[PDB]
Design a protein around this ligand. Sequence first.
Ligand code: GDP
Ligand code: YN9
Lengths: 55, 332, 296, 231, 355
Amino acid sequence: SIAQARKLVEQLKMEANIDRIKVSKAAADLMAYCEAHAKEDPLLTPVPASENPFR
Amino acid sequence: QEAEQLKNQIRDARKACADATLSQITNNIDPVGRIQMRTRRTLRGHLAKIYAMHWGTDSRLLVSASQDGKLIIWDSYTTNKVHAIPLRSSWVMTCAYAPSGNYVACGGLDNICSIYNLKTREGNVRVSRELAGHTGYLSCCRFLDDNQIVTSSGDTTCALWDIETGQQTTTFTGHTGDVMSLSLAPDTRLFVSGACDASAKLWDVREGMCRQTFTGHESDINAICFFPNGNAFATGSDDATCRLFDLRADQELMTYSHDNIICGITSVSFSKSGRLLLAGYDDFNCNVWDALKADRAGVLAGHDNRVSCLGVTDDGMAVATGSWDSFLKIWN
Amino acid sequence: TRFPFFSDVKGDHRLVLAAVETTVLVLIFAVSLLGNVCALVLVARRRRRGATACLVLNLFCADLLFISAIPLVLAVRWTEAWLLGPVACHLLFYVMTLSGSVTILTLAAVSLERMVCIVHLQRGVRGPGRRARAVLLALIWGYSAVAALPLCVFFRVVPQQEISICTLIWPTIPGEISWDVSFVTLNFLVPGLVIVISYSKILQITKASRKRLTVSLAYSESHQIRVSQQDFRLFRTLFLLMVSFFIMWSPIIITILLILIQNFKQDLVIWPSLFFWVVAFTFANSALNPILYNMT
Amino acid sequence: VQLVESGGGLVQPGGSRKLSCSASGFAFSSFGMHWVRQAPEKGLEWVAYISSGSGTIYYADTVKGRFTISRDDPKNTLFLQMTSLRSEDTAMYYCVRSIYYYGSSPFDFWGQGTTLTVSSADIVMTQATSSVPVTPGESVSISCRSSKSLLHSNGNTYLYWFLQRPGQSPQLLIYRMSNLASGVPDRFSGSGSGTAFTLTISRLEAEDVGVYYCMQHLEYPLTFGAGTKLE
Amino acid sequence: CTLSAEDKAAVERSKMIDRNLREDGEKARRELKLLLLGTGESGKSTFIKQMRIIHGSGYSDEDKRGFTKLVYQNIFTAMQAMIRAMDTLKIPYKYEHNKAHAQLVREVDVEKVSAFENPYVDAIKSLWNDPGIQECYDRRREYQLSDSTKYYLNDLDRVADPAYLPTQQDVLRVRVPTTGIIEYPFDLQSVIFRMVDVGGQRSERRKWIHCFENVTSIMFLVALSEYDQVLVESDNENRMEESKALFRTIITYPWFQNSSVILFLNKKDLLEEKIMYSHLVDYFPEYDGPQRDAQAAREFILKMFVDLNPDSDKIIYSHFTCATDTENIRAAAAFVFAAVKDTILQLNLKEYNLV
Ligand SMILES: Nc1nc2c(ncn2[C@@H]2O[C@H](COP(=O)(O)OP(=O)(O)O)[C@@H](O)[C@H]2O)c(=O)[nH]1
Ligand SMILES: Cc1ccc(-c2ccc(F)cc2COc2ccc(CCC(=O)O)cc2)cc1
């Protein structure tokens, strides 16, 4: 049990020492990527029928 | 006791960076609103439940696997069947299409991932390789390239295999329950994997070590995919809940659920810009959520049985949904 | 003189008999139309296009074509004479005979294909495929259009006081005898015998299988009163289908033979509205067929 | 991956000949087959086509009804029955393997052919010149023309560039005006506009000499040009 | 037809593929899939072995050469299990010297041994004939132990031969520790069957059981010897209760409402020899019948198991089998074929809106 507990402790240790960011920056990056490629999103912005490969 | 402390410090540090929520910062954007998609093509020919499909990287070809014991490669533009691959094991749960298009993968209850070469000089599709070494069924598989493939099994372990030698290059142990889904980062230097322990994990392909672990679902995580930038990923569980996890924030950001949705998600996928998350459900529907607000719910209601698989092209120009009524529909 | 069809003379109760007949036939038309259209909708949706799906949709098509002639009959009965013209006199009875022949032949084909598919699934072997179904439907409609040919060439409007009646003029008595006998024997007796044999064979196979399992021990200590209901239910259903076919298709055959006898020996007299009421009972077939063949 | 023709030879005026092709090492029942002529002092010429599954058959308007293509999949043997052989029928006849799905490279593998010596709405493909003097190590470019535009409204352009080296059967270089066949060095490329096509070779090596052919597949018949001889 | 030549050829190929798929998928409906279920040590691997012997090609001598190593792992595993159960039931050895022999067996690498020579043979023999070890075998009731232990330790001398080759019975009574779904097809009177055996898969059943929605029938193997063993090697749990729980879980699945259930009650002979020592009344209070009778026990177990069926819309074919001796498994196979034909009958009658 000592070896099994030791391995679990190390995994918890390595995940804790991470330079995380705030959720606000993550959400901002999400909406920035979304608004950056909004015109090139065919399902979000229906392409004209002449330029549609699926009619 | 030290393990509890490490879990304690992580949780308190976890709550620190959750100063706001994705919902609060998205109250100043215009919704897309209703999105009316149409079955431009209905791909017919599968005779049993369809369990997985994968788009080609040309955004036109499409492989799909059924319990009829067969993969079918479709030309989605003309509803033409390009290839038909009979499987050795008919209990197939997953399939993959290589980025270069030369290869296809499949696997299932036989615990073996079979790779098939598509560009042969003999004119047929041969079994290039049979990767064996998992002690449970294979739930997903994804080509990194023509040479390496990651397979997730019910072993509670994933495995990165070098195909040309057939041996597990690396193994990813650490899950408690059966691993059910798998998604590769755009650069394929990472992958993300959810299992029947309600937790997903972000795994490093190169170093082979589990970087991150995401908790928050209440049942099996049986659908997972990346936001197109590779910094976020959306899970689908049996809770009738999808959820957005950002790797940098190390948290959960927004939930995708409704009061009238009681059945679990079978598949998730994003739109080319990540503004739409399509989610296949067990109520025979396929919802389309505004991934930034969680309140769009366009419906691709054309299937009469459980929607088991769906996917969006690499130009976001369409979306294929295969379901348990053996039909693939291409919505645009 | 010559036996009138759908043309009667109403006396002190002209507004009573005509009204009640119109009400009865409108009820039959409504129930048949709604039942057959909903049956067609629910059968065309199925992705397991077995023999039953295609043959019952043929059945519902036949029923709709059969009831498509209700309003004309209402017009003839209400106006007490024929005014619809030679085209209607040549089309109405041909369409009714066509649809009745198709409906009976389709009941026979449904029973036969049910039994044959049961036998082939018991043997686990190949059977009649899609081509067989297409050939069967084509042959049914072709035979029902050929055997009904006289009833478009031998219906004429005759001034028989002299009033216009859409009656039937057989050129020769032997031809009338032969057509009536052949129609009856190959559109009521062969299909009926097929239905009886097919459904009794189904029941025999089921009972044989139940015996072959009950010789093991008993299936259970209690399930012998959980299987015996299924034998009773199957017997009830198959016997109901047989007797329903015979009871709701026998009066029209009897009246056809009565019209033959009257047009053979003028001694016998047949009531004027007896034919019409037997025709209404036959029209009830187009309503009760989707009931029996889509019970659930 | 091997096609062997048989049955060619000297025939009496008139007469008939059955030419066979044995396929070995591939799925010949999943491949369409072509018969392609070549005169002893002229370019290639398409004879016929049979489909994957024997569904459809195509002849040229100089042999139609006088020929017959057929196949036998269990023994993987293709047949051309040939009747009433006039003088214009003395040519080498090659059997070409050709598959058609999305992405296939038709005409990729040719047989070795067999000699047979006998004792206007079609698209017109036209070579620029019969030969091009060159120097080893240089960059070379030949051109070819078509009466119509081979750009079908589906986005494809069904031009094909073939190489026939001296003493060898042809060999697909370019399929559909731009795409390099498997095994062809990357030194080759093909480009142009509708009704104007150019084949370019960079770093011209030895054994790259021969005759280069510009065929079209937009419709049947398939029309060749004379083909430029790079010497 | 605006299609070009190449797209017309592509359409041709797609139609060819359509025809091939239709052919293969109508072959895939003449073959009836029987999902073989049950608990561990209930007798379903021996069941598939038996029908392979009487409907497949049987086991050739090369297969026996492959099986011999598994046989030796079985002999070592059974001996080690008895040895461990000796030290957990608090029973001492009548002979002290054999205790050392027992130690010689405790450190054996079961998964690695491929040779079976002295002193291991002599140590096993001297352990088995100990009065204490015989008492432990008699009292094997309270711990896990393969039923084929008597059979192997009373032919030790035969299996210790340098030229030993497993026989058909040895092939029957040996575990093949393979993981993964195993499909095995059959020809029963020109009807293609396929027993799908799972349970070698240690993963969660709920995640792959819907894959068997399209099974003709479920062959559930219950072992009639599961009573009179509340194993003390772990928490006190009866094995009959585990079998009943699994039966309820299987017959409440919505996937299996279209599929009949064939219940096979197995290990009947071992019930016959257990009745002469142990009676049902000690473990099942609802039972009320003769003490030294076997048919009463059999019918009590069947009545107890068939009444777990929640509804009257599912009939449970049942059989009393002994999946070790042939000419009884032939009767079981005939019963399976008959029950499957009856299931097909009832499904067709329900589809035709008759049953
Ligand atoms: N005496 C006897 N032993 C049996 C019978 N059925 C099974 N066994 C024994 O029980 C053991 C366990 O059966 P197995 O095949 O291991 O069952 P599984 O655990 O469901 O795969 C077999 O190896 C046989 O030795 C039976 O009817 N009689
Ligand atoms: C099988 C079947 C099906 C449907 C119907 C049916 C039903 C309603 C109706 F109004 C008319 C008909 C058919 O019309 C006839 C009228 C007169 C005769 C008399 C022949 C002589 O004896 O000369 C024969 C036929 C009959 C048989």
